[PDB]
Structure 1
């Protein structure tokens, strides 16, 4: 019968899945690339005043970001796009610990910014000296809400879910009613363990 319109509704969902993952994968990889390039280009030893201006310039007009920060070896925030009320320290963060040990870039899961209270995930790049000692950290915090609006903006009338590897809702876009009786086409992102589920839309009057 109209299994025909269903199968097509399904491949549309698949097409959407790849579009949206590609977008977010792109956003994450691009940010990583920006940070990596900053680390390479800035005169060493890092001058804090210069870093401060660079983060401001980079942060400027990129709703992508919750904030951009720079940390010292101890994990104190020493440069920041958000005016900081008190001293802030992120050495307790999972991504900080991992970044310190691996001396490699780290992407975090969603949490609530100590600095803004908003939900975010971060990209954290260790800055190394000549002897490959980790001395500082670039920290790029992305607003989860930006990703949500990004997806919503393109697929407002499909229901999509983003869930981490443990079932925690990262976010959803669109009306859940659309998912009734639908199995989702789904897949994980590249650099972060978030699973995206796109529900095909129902077969309607035709």
Structure 2
């Protein structure tokens, strides 16, 4: 009756390891892109940028690294493209352009690779603080799931956005039966993580 309250906190423990893992991953990525922005010679030479992105990508975290011009055209790209791609219609792009600040997108299906991702988009400013370009880092949802799964294969964990859209779930739902989850939002993106304690069992 009180191995209950322990299975509970054991799940609070899982919750924070996993949140932290994801927050770290996101923060580390933001910081990689922010540093690139600062280090690179302006105006940005597209050939050098291409090379930089490739060196940075060659990290299965990424679906890809991309560079955008003011219009939204993909001018540098880890993934070879058959046809020209424009990311302007993209929500994160719009938000990035208006705020002139880094943006973390909700999960979606990459127009470029076709797989579920989320993107970190960092605008590049000139001297007068106009947005001239964008660094774009796309991470596979797949990667996040697997990171969670390796740590806790046998324990159910559900991640859902602010509107109840399933981002992903790790482990077997059957483990959640009769259990209330210990839950919590991530820092940089409005994803709520729900960890289900295991049953009391002897």
Question: Using the alignment, how far apart are the partners of 2:193 and 2:93 within structure 1?
Answer: 26
- Structure 1 residue ranges (4+ consecutive) displaced by more than 3 angstroms after TM superposition: none
- The CA deviation at 1:136 is 0.2
Question: Using the alignment, how far apart are the partners of 1:177 and 1:98 within structure 2?
Answer: 39
> Once the two structures are superposed, what CA deviation does each residue of 1:123-162 show, in whole Å capped at 9, x if it has no partner?
0000001111100000000000000000000000100000
> Once the two structures are superposed, what CA deviation does each residue of 1:72-93 show, in whole Å capped at 9, x if it has no partner?
0000000000001100000000
The root-mean-square deviation of aligned C-alpha atoms, in Å, is 0.4
- The CA deviation at 1:5 is 1.0
Question: Using the alignment, how far apart are the partners of 2:71 and 2:147 within structure 1?
Answer: 35
Question: Using the alignment, how far apart are the partners of 2:98 and 2:163 within structure 1?
Answer: 24
1:6 aligns with 2:4: yes
Match of 1:21, SS? Answer: helix
Query: Which residue is equivalent to 1:166?
Result: 163
Query: Which residue is equivalent to 1:116?
Result: 113
Per the normalisation by structure 1, the TM-score is: 0.97
Structure 2, unmatched stretches of 5+, are: none
Aligned residue pairs: how many? Answer: 202
Question: Using the alignment, how far apart are the partners of 1:77 and 1:202 within structure 2?
Answer: 50
Question: Using the alignment, how far apart are the partners of 2:82 and 2:159 within structure 1?
Answer: 33
1:197 aligns with 2:180: no
Question: Using the alignment, how far apart are the partners of 2:94 and 2:174 within structure 1?
Answer: 41
Query: Which residue is equivalent to 1:133?
Result: 130
Question: Using the alignment, how far apart are the partners of 2:60 and 2:163 within structure 1?
Answer: 28
Per the normalisation by structure 2, the TM-score is: 0.99
Match of 1:4, SS? Answer: coil
- The CA deviation at 1:33 is 0.2
> Once the two structures are superposed, what CA deviation does each residue of 1:20-58 show, in whole Å capped at 9, x if it has no partner?
000000000000000000000001100000000000000
- The CA deviation at 1:180 is 0.3
- The CA deviation at 1:4 is 1.9
Match of 1:70, SS? Answer: strand
